[PDB]
């Protein structure tokens, strides 16, 4: 019932794929080559001229956080009540902010910008440590006592940052433990070890 | 029940203010001056070192779209069902994407970047005219038959863009009429005419 339409990269679909995999949901991958994209037709049919495109039956969605929120809603991964739902959003928006900075570094300014980025990184990661500390001493999820779509997105962000700056989580014991804990969830663990995950690059331009 | 903590500018609070005013809600403005921000204490206390900060009872929120979603969820401005909520998110994420570009122009590249931004603008607005075209002929709201938080956000986006690039909606009959229709809603109309809105600059650097 789900289709993911994307480039042959992890990128903005990593988190939503982890979510689907961990939740035992089945989906189709439709792969878009750089050549098809450059041909221009598919791009012109996309609402905002970008991928991912996501189909849930006849419901067609664009925007990676739209897809996360939609799956969060329909799969009960959006907090236990209205207050938790808002906290989940606050976490996801912070994740999205850091993701945009990471995307900027990777695609527009890797060589000149990397040292500065890594130096500023602890400052950008600290709010997630703080959230964890304020929730059951960081022993469960980013919000409340059940997983949310923000957990999968946060997890992705942290995983890609380790690759960017090995040991960056050494300064953050709760985030470190959290990555280990979520990454060990059985369906998730299997997915992250699988060719369909491992054989895709993180980004489209060979940088990580 | 609500408190908005922000600089004396419209910026990222404009949409949530329009929402509150139109929905007959009461709120307190806590105005933060340049001197107070520079002092550092308030900034250090903010989850992501940014304003707005929003209070509603004992709930403290940060991130303008988290605030919009919370108000949307709690006041019933988030579509009629899950499928509509997904479309609402899709519109809001698209509004936010263009807000991000607008902000980057205003704050970091106004004199060099304006000509390229304005030339690109029609292709950036067109998706919203298309959405309107596909929903009851553009006669109601951006999604469905009831107002949503995305409508308030889109209306703001459009109003600030008419200041930036006067006439930018002229080629878009549905958006043009939507702006007039929503702007005529009695409480919103009163708010938009009030000194509280009119006498604040859109941005914090004198550019618009
Ligand atoms: C195929 C490509 C050209 C479109 C390409 O290398 C590329 C550029 C930007 C991208 O994302 C940016 C983002 O905002 O996620 C991604 Cl995921 C890719 Cl694969
Ligand atoms: C505090 C400032 C430095 C003098 C300043 O002017 C400033 C910078 C970025 C901002 O974010 C833009 C947005 O609307 O998100 C805003 Cl709202 C302001 Cl007021
Ligand atoms: Ca986006
Ligand atoms: Ca943000
Ligand atoms: Ca309603
Ligand atoms: Cl952006
Ligand atoms: Pt951005």
Curated annotation (Swiss-Prot), chains A, B:
EC identifiers of the protein: 2.5.1.18
Subcellular location(s) per record: Cytoplasm; Mitochondrion; Nucleus
Residues modified as N6-succinyllysine: 101, 114
Residues forming coiled coils: none
Domain (GST N-terminal) ranges: 1-79
Role: Conjugation of reduced glutathione to a wide number of exogenous and endogenous hydrophobic electrophiles. Involved in the formation of glutathione conjugates of both prostaglandin A2 (PGA2) and prostaglandin J2 (PGJ2). Participates in the formation of novel hepoxilin regioisomers. Negatively regulates CDK5 activity via p25/p35 translocation to prevent neurodegeneration.
Name of the protein this chain belongs to: Glutathione S-transferase P
